[PDB]
Design a protein around this nucleic acid. Structure first.
Lengths: 98, 132, 149, 187
RNA sequence: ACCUAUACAUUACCGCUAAAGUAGAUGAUUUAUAUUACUUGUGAUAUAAAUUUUGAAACUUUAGUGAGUAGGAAGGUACAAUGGUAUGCGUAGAAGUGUUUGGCGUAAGCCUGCAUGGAGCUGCCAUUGGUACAGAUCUUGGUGGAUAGUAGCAAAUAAUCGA
RNA sequence: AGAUCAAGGUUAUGAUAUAAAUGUCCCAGUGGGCCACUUUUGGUAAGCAGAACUGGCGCUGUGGGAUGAACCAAACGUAAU
RNA sequence: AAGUGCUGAUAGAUUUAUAUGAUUACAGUGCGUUAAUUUUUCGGAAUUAUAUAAUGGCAUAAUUAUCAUUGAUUUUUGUGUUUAUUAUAUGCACUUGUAUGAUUAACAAUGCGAAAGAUUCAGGAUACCUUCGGGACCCGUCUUGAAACACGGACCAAGGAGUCUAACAUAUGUGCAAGUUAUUGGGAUAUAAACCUAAUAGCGUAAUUAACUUGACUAAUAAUGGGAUUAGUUUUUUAGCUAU
RNA sequence: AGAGUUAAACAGUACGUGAAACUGCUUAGAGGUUAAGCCCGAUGAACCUGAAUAUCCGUUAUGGAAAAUUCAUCAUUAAAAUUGUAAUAUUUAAAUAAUAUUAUGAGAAUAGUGUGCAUUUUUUCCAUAUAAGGACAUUGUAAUCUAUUAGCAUAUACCAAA
């Protein structure tokens, strides 16, 4: 089930494969009505498909940070979050403590 | 002499003890290797108090330190020499154990070759045998 | 020859009652063997899902022979794929030295029906039969539906 | 504690092609990238339709390639079909059109090329119209097929018309009691 | 006041579920410095050093969340064979078996040392089967307690001496 | 009762969305239930018999009631506080 | 209600942030107007105008709208007024500074992976023995309910039970597509394989009647013709957005 | 029981392996409570597994040796590729493309020769300077965040209660 045995063609062997499975242009003569199967993807190179300059004039958003940064502090014991969150509340600290 | 890897973590563990299969104390036919009981009036399946404990995924170890050995390394069964050349630049996450099939003749080379690539073999002094 | 891991028995083994129940065990034949009884204890199953079982509509033909109803069929829908479409372009210049000659019984067909909506060229159709709309919708285009022998 | 999340919080869909086809499982690899970096909805419905079975990618004859195209005003809109384009002999003269398809029957490749236009795999589409400008993305009927004719059946309602699982068409095959008002009843 | 749950809460970890991000690497990015356009000022160029693959079936980010018979679905795992493969292992010791050898796995399981053994065996990719046992008064062989010496060796009159 | 025009402000209670909508396989099992508040019929009563509603047990561990299938708290990934 | 002013303790601290993406925006320190005022004299210290809409305060106009209306409450504000309050007007360098990337790290002590040789500190219900505490009924089964005064089971090794087939139906995979399908046969031939292949034949392509009859849209064109609800491609002009 | 034979008698006619069930013997510790077993936390004994080197307020300051070089400011020379141009032939009339040949050019690349070619270069080992030659682990310590628990209490404002 494993494709690709190492193979050796002779000369007149190799010159008959354009008859057995005929060609891309015309069908075959030695297999009546046979027609070579067409792939679902003819160009099949992704790294040149994605390369590409026909596609990278469309692409929008290369989101380049990660933005994890998560921990919830406490704005009732950590004063430095009070003045980040309610900035006016810094004043009332320096007013009544004054 | 091999430095333990890649600035080692602290391997911590939910249970060390292994799970030991209902009624295996009672019978010599039952192996201690766990079976889930399926049977209806069973207090172990039902998870009664002070019966024992079943497996689940909740005891699953940290995904960093999963399969890590005591030495911070992870195993890699080596079976001949040119499997050690796989560990030429994995000698910093993995470690080799020479198989049980590998004979005393070849092990002397695997031990000497793996001393050059600095890997930490987990069983040298196997088939020593300071003999013929 | 069938991949067994996807069969349930690899998986149900072993929990006890193998998928079939503790209460209502997998017994031998708990409803009847076969189409028993589609007229008493399976009747709901037999009407729905098969209305029309259990009767006789009738005309008995002792030893039907399957040649006296042979009559293969063709609509006007094809009729012109039987000549080449590459032989349709030339009569579509327009230039009518034609109708063509189609001999539908030499192909395999007898009855020429009329589904169709065929083009404005004439045709000459030698088939053994007719529809009412096969005769009209050809002779409107000029040609003639003609009797094969 | 909370009551609840029951089910199905597990939403229901298919998320990779079940074809192990090495050509299809590469056009997916591409079209993942053409819809996460160009957020078109045109390109979702190609990644979504590269996933489905062969039911859900039903054939679409050469005449509906053409019968839809001639609904006009887009004379260079390529016809995008995630599936098969077969051939209609009941169409005689075929217009010159450009076709994107997974598979094209050769009796339709011999005709479209002769007209002559193009036949495109889905990688030549994306290297030409990555955002899908000037394309016509069609699909043939999913319930065209005759397995679907039998769904679902109470004889007793005035609307079923849904096709039993007989073995054979004739009299003395489910045609008597419960279908005719003489024998039994009319369903 | 205080004690008390597998509940509540904040944290670590496992899974699930739901979202979200990454693939121009004859590219991207640093740090300096030479030059520089110079826009005051900041970019572009040269040099020197540096970082920058992932079974994309992968990696990264985020949040919620976990009862279960009967029952269904997924993913693993043991057994044995076939077709390919591992330039596999093996009388310098295969299978098996034992074992306070040492670990791995959440588990099924698995690797390894020593012991015995004495000729074959395995990993992977396919496809398959006479494919996993605690039960069935299951089958067939073996063995325990009882009892390893207990019930018992009591009808038919009876033997004893010395050689 | 309809088919096309013309005019229309700010879309017409509240609070919700652990996604909803829809096919197929009507696929597995099930088609012996018991318990309880309030309602209730037969019986003299019954841990009896039979129904209506809601919740449970069945399938369910943990905390409490010394004890317990259903009571009262509470529903259960491995751990610390 | 305010931080008012703290003092005590507890447990915990993900992170290979490139083992395929900011360590930078913040603020905080150390150099470059002024002048008197004050205080200690060794610092500090204080001071105005410096530009606000000014927000709060006062007076007044003004109007929206109202508990109750003598009034009060407003509302849109607007002006004047001074009483205060707040923010903006800190670049260039430079730190071992704070924050923020699930915010744990600075100081010491103890001890040398130590050539073979070999200790220290932590850990090991691995699989047992010793010592205590807590919990803890026997499994399988049928059952509404089993530890049951329900049935089977003394113990152990081997064996041991959802399969082949036939015909359908659905789902998925694959090939070809109005077709498709060698396989009964034949031919080539390398060997019960593979290959090649004529005439059919099934199934599909057209149906409905008990039957004989009959046989699918106005038309050279048309997806339930027509209608709604339509993903999507084309398209409209409009400010308009990044570049221009 | 010695001895002998064999590679082996732990292959001596249960004749390969030799499992379990059950057990005689040795060694170890222990015994009046769920009958014993068992779960979880610890324990004594025993055995065992794992453990670390380029820095504070740096992969910085600085002196010794050795060898040597396609390295220099090196220079020629010989290749073989790479990359990018151009040309021919294969091509689906053309182009594109793709292959294969031909040729240009740059920088690189080895190998050989080469101011001084060891002049201060160049690859490798040694000196002293700030915290210290650690870099780790096990700990007492310290302050920080999260969740929390107990504690003292500067001060306003409110309603009648005089």
């Amino acid at each position: 089930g494993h494709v690709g045995r190492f193979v050796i063609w002779t000369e007149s062997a190799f010159a008959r494969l354009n008859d057995l499975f005929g060609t891309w242009k015309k069908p075959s003569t030695l297999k009546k009505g046979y027609n070579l199967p067409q792939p679902k993807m003819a160009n099949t190179d992704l790294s040149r498909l994605l390369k590409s300059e026909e596609i990278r004039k469309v692409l929008r958003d290369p989101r380049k940070r990660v933005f994890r940064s998560v921990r919830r502090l406490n704005p009732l014991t950590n004063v430095r979050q009070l003045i980040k969150l309610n900035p006016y509340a810094e004043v009332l600290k320096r007013r009544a403590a004054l | 002499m091999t430095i333990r890897p890649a600035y080692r973590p602290k391997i911590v563990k939910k249970r060390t003890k292994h799970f030991i299969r209902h009624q295996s104390d009672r019978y010599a036919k039952l192996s201690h290797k766990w079976r889930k009981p399926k049977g209806i009036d069973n207090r172990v399946r039902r998870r009664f108090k002070g019966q024992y404990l079943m497996p689940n995924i909740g005891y699953g170890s940290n995904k960093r330190t999963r399969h890590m050995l005591p030495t911070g390394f992870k195993k890699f069964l080596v079976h001949n020499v040119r499997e050690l050349e796989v560990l030429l630049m994995q000698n910093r996450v993995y470690c080799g154990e020479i198989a049980h099939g590998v004979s005393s003749k070849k092990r002397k080379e695997i031990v000497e070759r793996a001393k050059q690539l600095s890997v930490r073999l987990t069983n040298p002094n196997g088939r020593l045998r300071s003999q013929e | 020859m069938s991949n067994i891991k996807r069969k349930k028995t690899r998986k149900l083994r072993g929990h006890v009652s193998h998928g079939h129940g503790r209460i209502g065990k997998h017994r031998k034949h708990p409803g009847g063997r076969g189409n028993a009884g589609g007229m008493h204890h399976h009747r709901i199953n037999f009407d729905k899902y098969h209305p029309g079982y259990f009767g006789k509509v009738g005309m008995r033909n002792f030893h039907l022979r399957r040649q006296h109803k042979f009559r293969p069929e063709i609509n006007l829908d094809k009729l012109w794929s039987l000549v080449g479409a590459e032989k349709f372009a030339e009569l579509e210049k327009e230039k009518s030295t034609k109708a063509p000659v189609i001999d539908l019984v030499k192909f395999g067909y007898y009855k020429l029906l009329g589904r169709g909506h065929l083009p404005a060229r004439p045709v000459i159709v030698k088939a053994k039969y007719f529809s009412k709309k096969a005769e009209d919708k050809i002779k409107k285009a000029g040609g003639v539906c003609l009797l094969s022998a | 504690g909370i009551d609840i999340n029951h089910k199905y919080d597990r939403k229901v869909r298919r998320t990779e092609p079940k074809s192990q086809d090495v050509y299809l499982r590469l056009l997916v690899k591409l079209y993942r990238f053409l819809q996460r970096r160009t957020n078109k909805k045109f390109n979702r419905i190609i990644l979504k339709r590269l996933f489905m079975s062969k039911i859900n990618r039903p054939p679409l004859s050469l005449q509906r390639i053409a019968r839809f195209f001639k609904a006009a005003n887009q004379p260079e809109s390529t016809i995008v079909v995630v599936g098969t384009v077969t051939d209609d002999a009941r169409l005689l003269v075929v217009p010159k059109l450009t076709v994107c398809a997974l598979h094209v029957t050769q009796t339709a490749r011999e005709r479209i090329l002769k007209a002559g236009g193009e036949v495109l795999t889905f990688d030549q589409l994306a290297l030409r119209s990555p955002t899908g400008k000037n394309t016509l993305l069609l699909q043939g009927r999913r319930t065209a097929r005759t397995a679907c004719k039998h769904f679902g059946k109470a004889p007793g309602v005035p609307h079923s018309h849904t096709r039993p699982y007989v073995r054979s068409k004739g009299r003395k095959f489910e045609r008597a009691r419960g279908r005719r008002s003489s024998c039994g009843y009319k369903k």
